[PDB]
Copies of this chain bind each other. A is one copy, B any other.
């Protein structure tokens, strides 16, 4: 028996898998390249001093006092945490489906089975009572609206992230804080690079295109009365029946 429509499950699967697939590709590239940041330290620096510079600048991306970037410090904030936000979007998009299957799936399952059993025998009072009620349709529309809002916010974020200048992956960092402040052997600023930024912007473009094409599909899902071929549980039950009526032989015989 089906408790989720084909278009809804397609949308959920795309919106959840795509961010995770892109995260997997980004992680593979990260392990392949070996570093998400690289700083140019002097040749007098030993290997561990250069590694300290790299790690300090990586940790200093989130600190105001030791950075200088032409695009501002917000772009450098986002480059470091890009995969985290993608997984956050994936979880937030997967949750509404989880809540629907936990809460409303069983009640709709029972109602559909009861309707299909009263059908195949001919229940009008049951259908009219559902027409009066607006319980399940409210849950369905609320879940779809949460999904739509999450997708819209993801589109806004990915459009902003892709908007960041390609040279936003460069920044100047200073390690001369604390005891190192008066170290005359350390240069004042180090030129750093965020290596993965180039991958992240193309991944954001891909996800943005997919979500922009997916938004109209989600919008079409709200017009539940129009999909049926007012806003009441009767309308949603009708849609589920038509998507499910293929399993009722009597329906096919009547169609003939």
Contacts and interface: CB of A to CB of B under 8 A. Distances in A.
Interface stretch (A147-155, A170-178, A232-240): A170-178
Of the candidates A25, A58, A63, A195, the one having the most CB atoms from chain B within 10 angstroms of its own CB is A58
Nearest to A117: B249
Contact of A28 (B27, B55, B91, B109): B27
Contacts of A62: 166, 198
A60 B255 CA distance: 64
Number of copies: 7
Contacts of A177: 170, 191
A160 interface: no
Contacts of A65: 167
A40 interface: yes
A41 B183 CA distance: 12
Nearest to A172: B179
A168 to B, nearest CB: 11
A46 interface: yes
Interface of A: 2, 6-7, 9-10, 13, 21, 25, 27-28, 30-36, 38-41, 43-52, 54-56, 58-59, 61-63, 65, 80-81, 84, 87-88, 91, 98-99, 102-103, 106-107, 109-111, 114, 117, 123, 125-126, 129, 166-167, 169-170, 172, 175, 177-180, 185, 189-191, 193-195, 197-199, 202, 206, 246-247, 249, 252, 255-256
8 contacts: A21-B87, A38-B52, A46-B50, A47-B48, A48-B50, A49-B50, A59-B194, A178-B191
